[PDB]
Every structure is written in structure tokens, then in C-alpha cells.
Amino acid sequence: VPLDGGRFATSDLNDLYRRVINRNNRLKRLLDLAAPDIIVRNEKRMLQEAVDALLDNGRRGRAITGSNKRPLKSLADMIKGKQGRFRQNGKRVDYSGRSVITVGPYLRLHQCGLPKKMALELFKPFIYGKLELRGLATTIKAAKKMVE
Amino acid sequence: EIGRTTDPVRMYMREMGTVELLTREGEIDIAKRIEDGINQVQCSVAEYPEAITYLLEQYDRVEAEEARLSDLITGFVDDPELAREKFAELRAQYVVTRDTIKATAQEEILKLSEVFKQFRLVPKQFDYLVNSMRVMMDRVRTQERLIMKLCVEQCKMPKKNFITLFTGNETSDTWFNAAIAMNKPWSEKLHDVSEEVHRALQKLQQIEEETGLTIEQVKDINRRMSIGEAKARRAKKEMVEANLRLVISIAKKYTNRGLQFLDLIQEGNIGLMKAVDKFEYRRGYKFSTYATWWIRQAITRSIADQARTIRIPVHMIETINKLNRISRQMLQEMGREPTPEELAERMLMPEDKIRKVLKIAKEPISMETPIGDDEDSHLGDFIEDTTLELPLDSATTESLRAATHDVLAGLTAREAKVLRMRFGIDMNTDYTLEEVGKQFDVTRERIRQIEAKALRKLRHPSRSEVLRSFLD
Amino acid sequence: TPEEKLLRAIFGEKASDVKDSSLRVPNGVSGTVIDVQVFTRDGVEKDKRA
Amino acid sequence: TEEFDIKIALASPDMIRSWSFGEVKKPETINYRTFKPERDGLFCARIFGPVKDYECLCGKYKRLKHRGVICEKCGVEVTQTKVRRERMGHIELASPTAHIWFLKSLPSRIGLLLDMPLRDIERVLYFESYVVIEGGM
Ligand SMILES: [Zn+2]
Incomplete structure (x- = not known):
């Protein structure tokens, strides 16, 4: 994806895929060129070292990233635990807020305060349903201004 | 060993x-x-x-x-x-x-x-x-x-x-x-x-x-x-x-x-x-x-x-290298540094290409670089995506089908039919106004004017009263 | 889309040839404007304000 | 979508050729002058769908009446661009390569299957010593 400003912000799976396709494309040139066997042994053992840094990086020399000094992130490091699975064990969530709490000792046991500035942004789409059912706004864009 | x-x-x-x-x-x-x-x-x-x-x-x-004069012979031996x-x-x-x-x-x-x-x-x-x-x-x-x-x-x-x-x-x-x-x-x-x-x-x-x-x-x-x-x-x-x-x-x-x-x-x-x-x-x-x-x-x-992610050619690579060999002599001689106005004279380029060669060199960031302070978060969590569209625009275009299914429903049997046909409403690709007539058989200034007066009728307010609010 | 085009011919509105991306004050913050800086790359003409 | 009730197993070289919609035979990613994805590369468009919603790459087929027709200049098919998110390619290795998970994980499946110590297989993957195949008489 292109960052704002002219510079691109790639993943680091494009460095490990662009290295399996070079050492594999050069190994086809080296075999149709009839190289001595001392060279096409350094290409087979050099190809399959780039493929084993793709799947799980670290069980070997830990092929550090280019243009930096930290190790790349292989495929088995995205699945591998961060203390949680990749899927749901994490789910950031819509329709939510957060703020500081205070005392308010006038309440019952089954209620709580909630500011008018969070009740109008948490419950926004519930409001566009009333402002058109009650007949005040005409369309749903014209109601988006009355809530502003 | x-x-x-x-x-x-x-x-x-x-x-x-x-x-x-x-x-x-x-x-x-x-x-x-x-x-x-x-x-x-x-x-x-x-x-x-x-x-x-x-x-x-x-x-x-x-x-x-049926062949060239060079790619068959290169001079007899001795x-x-x-x-x-x-x-x-x-x-x-x-x-x-x-x-x-x-x-x-x-x-x-x-x-x-x-x-x-x-x-x-x-x-x-x-x-x-x-x-x-x-x-x-x-x-x-x-x-x-x-x-x-x-x-x-x-x-x-x-x-x-x-x-x-x-x-x-x-x-x-x-x-x-x-x-x-x-x-x-x-x-x-x-x-x-x-x-x-x-x-x-x-x-x-x-x-x-x-x-x-x-x-x-x-x-x-x-x-x-x-x-x-x-x-x-x-x-x-x-x-x-x-x-x-x-x-x-x-x-x-x-x-x-x-x-x-x-x-x-x-x-x-x-x-x-x-x-x-x-x-x-x-x-x-x-x-x-x-x-x-x-x-x-x-x-x-x-x-x-x-060696580059975004590949630049081999003739452009020689110009960037030629622009650092010369951007160094301007450094250790002029002292402070050169400017893209002054590189126009040291080199011999039109001063607008040198402003295009400058932003071609930089390579992409990696989306795992830990952000400042090295928090428990990377730069891949802060780039949003723009192919998506707001669910309020998706709730509007589903509300435009409701009105036009109505405001067109106030028109006659075929004076609405031309409107669904001349435009592309509720169909595949729209048709030509002389192609429209191939269903009515009357391809003339009538059909190409039937749409205008008919769609002028909706222009009469209190019919397009609701539709007026969908502009902005 | 098709419906957006029929909504045009009924009102003949001109197409918008430029998208608006102004700078706007953040939500819920309000106070005077006590300064302004204007930098210009060397080679473009300054507007009347800069 | 139909209800699902989940399996797992190895994958053959003739199944991995079935998920894929084309081969990726060049390392180039984008074009550097216009940012249209180059052909045959990693971010290809003929292989992993079109970049813009319902339109070819050149621009011949921009409308919506063309809903499945793959272009003739460059064989992009005019569909939605979320299909750039469910497709896969495949690289055709010029020589095999031991999958590391099934070789270096602690009880080596390549190891205890063939009945060979893991120090002796790592000596053969690096071309440090031969290993007899079908010794015969
Ligand atoms: Zn095309």
C-alpha cells in the first residue's frame, strides 16, 4: 500500500518471495547454460535455504531483513502465537467508547451515568431510524446533519 | 572436518x-x-x-x-x-x-x-x-x-x-x-x-x-x-x-x-x-x-x-549514481550542500527531470517496523484501507432505488419504460435512442423527445420534491 | 451509477471536477487562531496571503 | 454459503496446482512510473484479478454490461476487486526442496520414517555426502 507522501509501505513477505523467484530463476539459467557442477550445487543449496526462510525463519542463520537490521517475518511467524491466535483468541470492536469514572452516589443499583457526548456517538444509527420514522428528516443524509 | x-x-x-x-x-x-x-x-x-x-x-x-550481410560470415580464416x-x-x-x-x-x-x-x-x-x-x-x-x-x-x-x-x-x-x-x-x-x-x-x-x-x-x-x-x-x-x-x-x-x-x-x-x-x-x-x-x-x-522492490531500469540507475557522484563534489567544495537549482548547472539536465529523479530512489518501508517508543504495536495497524465505502453511502444508494422505483412509478406505462430503457435503471447496459425505438419500432424525434417532456414532468416540483434532497 | 445519472438529467447539475479535502478543526476543540506559517517550495508563485 | 462442519492434511504437487490461477514467473512488483502492476510479477493482474472494481487494466472494458468478459489485450477479467484477495499463484521450483516443518521439527517425520538420524539427512541435503538408492546386487 502507498503511504501518504510518495513512499510505499510494503509487507516483509515481498522480500522472501522476491528471493525465492530470483534464486529459482537463476537456477534455470544455470542448468540450460551447462555450468560446472561445483556451481549448480551452490545454487541448489542456496535456493532451498531461501525457501526454508520463507516458511519458518529462524531455524537457520536467521536471514536478516534488507535495508534494516531486524529479522524478517516468515509465514510461520504470523500464525505462531503472540500469546493469542491470529483469528479471535483479538477482535477490536465497533460501537464502543471509554472515559474516566467518578462517583455519582445518587444512582440506583441498576443504572450508570453516560455523557451526552458518548450517548450521541455510540447510538448514532439508532437515531437515524427515529428521525425518519418520526418524520422529522426526509432522507438519511438530511438526518446526518441534524445529529451534527 | x-x-x-x-x-x-x-x-x-x-x-x-x-x-x-x-x-x-x-x-x-x-x-x-x-x-x-x-x-x-x-x-x-x-x-x-x-x-x-x-x-x-x-x-x-x-x-x-533473405538474410543479412553480417550474421552469416565474419571473414575467412587466414x-x-x-x-x-x-x-x-x-x-x-x-x-x-x-x-x-x-x-x-x-x-x-x-x-x-x-x-x-x-x-x-x-x-x-x-x-x-x-x-x-x-x-x-x-x-x-x-x-x-x-x-x-x-x-x-x-x-x-x-x-x-x-x-x-x-x-x-x-x-x-x-x-x-x-x-x-x-x-x-x-x-x-x-x-x-x-x-x-x-x-x-x-x-x-x-x-x-x-x-x-x-x-x-x-x-x-x-x-x-x-x-x-x-x-x-x-x-x-x-x-x-x-x-x-x-x-x-x-x-x-x-x-x-x-x-x-x-x-x-x-x-x-x-x-x-x-x-x-x-x-x-x-x-x-x-x-x-x-x-x-x-x-x-x-x-x-x-x-x-x-535488488530493488519497485524495479527501476538500468538506464535510470546510471543517472542516480551520476547524481550522487556529483552531489558529493558540491558538498565537500561548497561546504554546506547543493540545491536542486544548482545541480542543474553542475549536471546538464533541464532542471525538471532532476526533480523527477529525486523522488524515484527511495525504497519502501517494512510494515513491521515498531513505532516510536517501541510500543507493543507495529506500523501495520495504522494504515487504513480505502477500497471500502462508508455504510452511510451504502445506506443511501439503497434508498435511491426506493425513490426512483416510486417517482418513476407515478409515470405512465411506457413513459416510465423509456426512462428505465434510455437510462440503465433495473437493467443491463442501456440502449441507444434509435436502438430504444427498435422495441417500439418508432425511432424518431418523438422517442428522443418523449424522454425530455416525461422527465420534464418529474421536474415539476412536488413530484421530484423527494428526489431534490438527494443532491447536495 | 444509473440512478445517480437519472437524478442528474432531472436537475442538470454540472459534474464536480475536483474533490474537497480542506483542513478542518478537530472535533470538540475550539479557540482562537494565534498564528499561521506558510512555507513555499522554491519555484512556485506565492499566493496573496503568503 | 453452505454450513461447514474442518479437516487438514498434506498437499500434493497436483493439488497445489489446483488452487492456483496462474504461475508467477518474474519478481517485479509494480512499474515505478505509472503504478499499474506489471505482468507475470508478484502483484500481477492477469493472475490475481483486477485492481479496480469492474474494469480491465488498459481501460477498454470499463462499463458494467461486461461482467465476465476477460480482456483480449491483457487477459484480466472484469469482476470485483475483492477477488484479489482469495486467489493464489504457484512458483515452479526447478528442483525439489525439503519442507522444513517436516524435517527439522523435533521428531523429524522425514527422519523417523526413513529410519535415518537427523544428523545424517542434514548431511545429504547440503550435498556433503551421497546416499545409496536401490543398491541391488
Ligand atoms: Zn485490457
């Missing part, structure tokens, strides 16, 4: 340090063989007359423009100026040689074949000769395999005696009358498939008739040519395996440019194999001053082409 070492650098370095460096006499002594390695090839092709037909007509194709005089002497002898074979029945073609070496060739017209004649052995070699494939694989023929009578021979009737005569069990069975194994071996005689020579002529030419051919690879393997230490020193200056250390020395060897290919010692210059160019050339030609 095999000490559980993993990294492929140490495993390649020691695997190279077995061979020992060559002397100044070893090079010419090794290279001396390569000339002999080709010398047994060029003599092994002249007696196969099929090359001349391909290239002797190449001069007819040259003056008639262009129109020199080719026309001698190339006719190819034919000037050609009419001489072929008449004896219609004694010296073979020597006359030898008189031309012994002398065909004196017509130098370029690689483009070279590979076809070695390819065509080697193509013929592709077929007739399995023909002998075919004769085994039917005779012994069907009729239990003895493969121990028929071989010597028919190993490469392919032209006689040895197991047609001689083998069958003994009255063995394989003998009487062979005549059932006798003609099939003969019609299949008719191609080989047709092939040797396609060349004018015999399979003995055909085989040994494509048998000896491979003899002197492998004698070269034994040599090129010898000189390349020695100088592999030369590549590690040249390919170490370019170490930190985004291309790994091993991807360099494996890119040099692919060039060094070309230096030994093109080397010619009769200039008298030593090898290291010659292969050091082809090696250092390929190690930098590859850094330009395959």
Missing part, C-alpha cells in the same frame, strides 16, 4: 579451496585444449555436407535479401568486398565435387569438405549446423532402438549377435535372410513383423538419403563431433573451477547494496563462465585483466536489475 556448519558461505568457501590457482603457463596450456576442443568439432562438421546447403543458399538469400569472391569458390569447387559421387567418388566432396573450414561463421548461423545434424541423430538413434523394440521385444530375437551385424549399420538385410536361415524359434516369427521393422528402418535410409551420406557417415560425424565437444567442457570446467577465488574478492566490494553476499558470487560465476567462453590468448594479455571486466560487469548489472 565436517563440523556441523550450517551457513552456506563457509560450506562454499572450503568447497572451493580444494583446487589450486593456475600459473601463467597453465592458462595457455588449458586454453590450448579449448581450441583443439573446437578444432575436432569444426572438422567433424565439414564432412557432413548438410551444413553447406543451409549456408551456401544463404548467399543467394544474402544478395536476394561484407560484400571479400565474401563474393571466395563464396563463389565455394560453388566454384561445389560443382566440381558433387560430380564424382553421381576412384575419387568420395574424395571430391572431401576436396570441398577438407576446404570448407576456410569460411568463418558467426554464432547465429553456427548453432543451426550443430543443431540440425544433431537433430538427425535424435531419430535414427532410436530407430536402432526400434529394431530392438520389435525384433527382440516381440519375436525373442537374440540381441547378442544381431547387434554387431546391426549396431549403427541400419542399412543391410542381415536378420532378413541370414538370421532367419538358421530356423530358430525367433527366426520364423520375425517375418510376421519383418516389413514393419523394415518400413520403420526405411526412415533411416530415407534420412541418410535426405543427407546423401550413410548412417556410417551420419553416425560418426554426430559421434566424433560429440567426441571433440566434451573435450572442451573438460577444459572450461578446469579454468572456471580454478579462478573461483577471483570472484570472491571482486564480489566483496559490492557487499552491502541490498543483495546478499551469496547472490553476488553466484552472479559473478555466471559472468566468469562467459569470460572463459570468449577468451582469446593470442592477444597476449593475461586472463585476470580480461575476466575481471566480465565479472565486475555482471555483479553490477544484477545489482541494478534485481
Whole structure:
């Protein structure tokens, strides 16, 4: 994806895929060129070292990233635990807020305060349903201004 | 000694340090063989007359423009100026040689074949000769395999005696009358498939008739040519395996440019194999001053082409390098630094291309770089995506189908029909106003005006009263 | 889309040839404007304000 | 979508050729002058769908009446661009390569299957010593 400003912000799976396709494309040139066997042994053992840094990086020399000094992130490091699975064990969530709490000792046991500035942004789409059912706004864009 | 070492650098370095460096006499002594390695090839092709037909007509194709004047010849050994005089002497002898074979029945073609070496060739017209004649052995070699494939694989023929009578021979009737005569069990069975194994071996005689020579002529030419051919690879393997230490020193200056250390020395060897290919010692210059160019050339030609994520060409790469060599002299001379107004004069560019070359160089960030303070979060959680669309615009375009299904529903039977047809509402691709009429049959100013007055009716307010609110 | 085009011909509105991306004050913050800086790359003409 | 009730197993070289919609035979990613994805590369468009919603790459087929017609200049098919998110390619290795998970994970499946110590297989993957195949008589 292109960052704002002219510079691109790639993943680091494009460095490990662009290295399996070079050492594999050069190994086809080296075999149709009839190289001595001392060279096409350094290409087979050099190809399959780039493929084993793709799947799980670290069980070997830990092929550090280019243009930096930290190790790349292989495929088995995205699945591998961060203390949680990749899927749901994490789910950031819509329709939510957060703020500081205070005392308010006038309440019952089954209620709580909630500011008018969070009740109008948490419950926004519930409001566009009333402002058109009650007949005040005409369309749903014209109601988006009355809530502003 | 095999000490559980993993990294492929140490495993390649020691695997190279077995061979020992060559002397100044070893090079010419090794290279001396390569000339002999080709010398047994060029003599092994002249007696196969099929090359001349391909290239002797190449001069007819040259003056008639069915080929060029350079990619067939490069000057006889020991262009129109020199080719026309001698190339006719190819034919000037050609009419001489072929008449004896219609004694010296073979020597006359030898008189031309012994002398065909004196017509130098370029690689483009070279590979076809070695390819065509080697193509013929592709077929007739399995023909002998075919004769085994039917005779012994069907009729239990003895493969121990028929071989010597028919190993490469392919032209006689040895197991047609001689083998069958003994009255063995394989003998009487062979005549059932006798003609099939003969019609299949008719191609080989047709092939040797396609060349004018015999399979003995055909085989040994494509048998000896491979003899002197492998004698070269034994040599090129010898000189390349020695100088592999030369590549590690040249390919170490370019170490930190985004291309790994091993991807360099494996890119040099692919060039060094070309230096030994093109080397010619009769200039008298030593090898290291010659292969050091082809090696250092390929190690930098590859850094330009395959070390950037977003690939920039090799002619643009030379301009950026030319813009830092000159952006340094402006630094250590002017003191502070240069400006993109002042680089217009140091270099000689139009001052607007230099503003395009400046923002091409920068390579992409990685989406795992930990953000400032090194929090428990990376830069990949802060780039939102824009292919999506707001669920309030998706809730509006579903509300436009409700109105136009209504506001159009207030119109007549077909005065709404043209509106769904002339525009693309509720259909596939809309139609042409004269194409619209092909459903009504009246293609005229009526139909192209029916839409206007009708859609003018909706313009009458309190009908488009609701639709007016969908603009902004 | 098709409905957006029929909504045009009924009102003949001109197409918008430029998208609006102004800078706007953040939500819920309000106070005076006590300064302004204007930098210009060397080679473009300054507006009347800069 | 139909209800699902989940499996796992190895994958053959003839199944991995079934998920893929094309081969990726060049390392180039984008064009550097215009940012249209180059052809045959990693971010290809003929292989992993079109970049813009319902339109070819050149621009011949921009409308919506063309809903499945793959272009003839460059064989992009005019569909939605979320299909750039469910497709895969495949690289065709010029020589095999031991899958590291099934070789270096602690009880080596390549190891205890063939009945060979893991120090002796790592000596054969690095071309440090041969290993006899079908010794015969
Ligand atoms: Zn196209």
C-alpha cells in the first residue's frame, strides 16, 4: 500500500518471495547454460535455504531483513502465537467508547451515568431510524446533519 | 572436518579451496585444449555436407535479401568486398565435387569438405549446423532402438549377435535372410513383423538419403563431433573451477547494496563462465585483466536489475549514481550542500527531470517496523484501507432505488419504460435512442423527445420534491 | 451509477471536477487562531496571503 | 454459503496446482512510473484479478454490461476487486526442496520414517555426502 507522501509501505513477505523467484530463476539459467557442477550445487543449496526462510525463519542463520537490521517475518511467524491466535483468541470492536469514572452516589443499583457526548456517538444509527420514522428528516443524509 | 556448519558461505568457501590457482603457463596450456576442443568439432562438421546447403543458399538469400550481410560470415580464416569472391569458390569447387559421387567418388566432396573450414561463421548461423545434424541423430538413434523394440521385444530375437551385424549399420538385410536361415524359434516369427521393422528402418535410409551420406557417415560425424565437444567442457570446467577465488574478492566490494553476499558470487560465476567462453590468448594479455571486466560487469548489472522492490531500469540507475557522484563534489567544495537549482548547472539536465529523479530512489518501508517508543504495536495497524465505502453511502444508494422505483412509478406505462430503457435503471447496459425505438419500432424525434417532456414532468416540483434532497 | 445519472438529467447539475479535502478543526476543540506559517517550495508563485 | 462442519492434511504437487490461477514467473512488483502492476510479477493482474472494481487494466472494458468478459489485450477479467484477495499463484521450483516443518521439527517425520538420524539427512541435503538408492546386487 502507498503511504501518504510518495513512499510505499510494503509487507516483509515481498522480500522472501522476491528471493525465492530470483534464486529459482537463476537456477534455470544455470542448468540450460551447462555450468560446472561445483556451481549448480551452490545454487541448489542456496535456493532451498531461501525457501526454508520463507516458511519458518529462524531455524537457520536467521536471514536478516534488507535495508534494516531486524529479522524478517516468515509465514510461520504470523500464525505462531503472540500469546493469542491470529483469528479471535483479538477482535477490536465497533460501537464502543471509554472515559474516566467518578462517583455519582445518587444512582440506583441498576443504572450508570453516560455523557451526552458518548450517548450521541455510540447510538448514532439508532437515531437515524427515529428521525425518519418520526418524520422529522426526509432522507438519511438530511438526518446526518441534524445529529451534527 | 565436517563440523556441523550450517551457513552456506563457509560450506562454499572450503568447497572451493580444494583446487589450486593456475600459473601463467597453465592458462595457455588449458586454453590450448579449448581450441583443439573446437578444432575436432569444426572438422567433424565439414564432412557432413548438410551444413553447406543451409549456408551456401544463404548467399543467394544474402544478395536476394533473405538474410543479412553480417550474421552469416565474419571473414575467412587466414561484407560484400571479400565474401563474393571466395563464396563463389565455394560453388566454384561445389560443382566440381558433387560430380564424382553421381576412384575419387568420395574424395571430391572431401576436396570441398577438407576446404570448407576456410569460411568463418558467426554464432547465429553456427548453432543451426550443430543443431540440425544433431537433430538427425535424435531419430535414427532410436530407430536402432526400434529394431530392438520389435525384433527382440516381440519375436525373442537374440540381441547378442544381431547387434554387431546391426549396431549403427541400419542399412543391410542381415536378420532378413541370414538370421532367419538358421530356423530358430525367433527366426520364423520375425517375418510376421519383418516389413514393419523394415518400413520403420526405411526412415533411416530415407534420412541418410535426405543427407546423401550413410548412417556410417551420419553416425560418426554426430559421434566424433560429440567426441571433440566434451573435450572442451573438460577444459572450461578446469579454468572456471580454478579462478573461483577471483570472484570472491571482486564480489566483496559490492557487499552491502541490498543483495546478499551469496547472490553476488553466484552472479559473478555466471559472468566468469562467459569470460572463459570468449577468451582469446593470442592477444597476449593475461586472463585476470580480461575476466575481471566480465565479472565486475555482471555483479553490477544484477545489482541494478534485481535488488530493488519497485524495479527501476538500468538506464535510470546510471543517472542516480551520476547524481550522487556529483552531489558529493558540491558538498565537500561548497561546504554546506547543493540545491536542486544548482545541480542543474553542475549536471546538464533541464532542471525538471532532476526533480523527477529525486523522488524515484527511495525504497519502501517494512510494515513491521515498531513505532516510536517501541510500543507493543507495529506500523501495520495504522494504515487504513480505502477500497471500502462508508455504510452511510451504502445506506443511501439503497434508498435511491426506493425513490426512483416510486417517482418513476407515478409515470405512465411506457413513459416510465423509456426512462428505465434510455437510462440503465433495473437493467443491463442501456440502449441507444434509435436502438430504444427498435422495441417500439418508432425511432424518431418523438422517442428522443418523449424522454425530455416525461422527465420534464418529474421536474415539476412536488413530484421530484423527494428526489431534490438527494443532491447536495 | 444509473440512478445517480437519472437524478442528474432531472436537475442538470454540472459534474464536480475536483474533490474537497480542506483542513478542518478537530472535533470538540475550539479557540482562537494565534498564528499561521506558510512555507513555499522554491519555484512556485506565492499566493496573496503568503 | 453452505454450513461447514474442518479437516487438514498434506498437499500434493497436483493439488497445489489446483488452487492456483496462474504461475508467477518474474519478481517485479509494480512499474515505478505509472503504478499499474506489471505482468507475470508478484502483484500481477492477469493472475490475481483486477485492481479496480469492474474494469480491465488498459481501460477498454470499463462499463458494467461486461461482467465476465476477460480482456483480449491483457487477459484480466472484469469482476470485483475483492477477488484479489482469495486467489493464489504457484512458483515452479526447478528442483525439489525439503519442507522444513517436516524435517527439522523435533521428531523429524522425514527422519523417523526413513529410519535415518537427523544428523545424517542434514548431511545429504547440503550435498556433503551421497546416499545409496536401490543398491541391488
Ligand atoms: Zn485490457
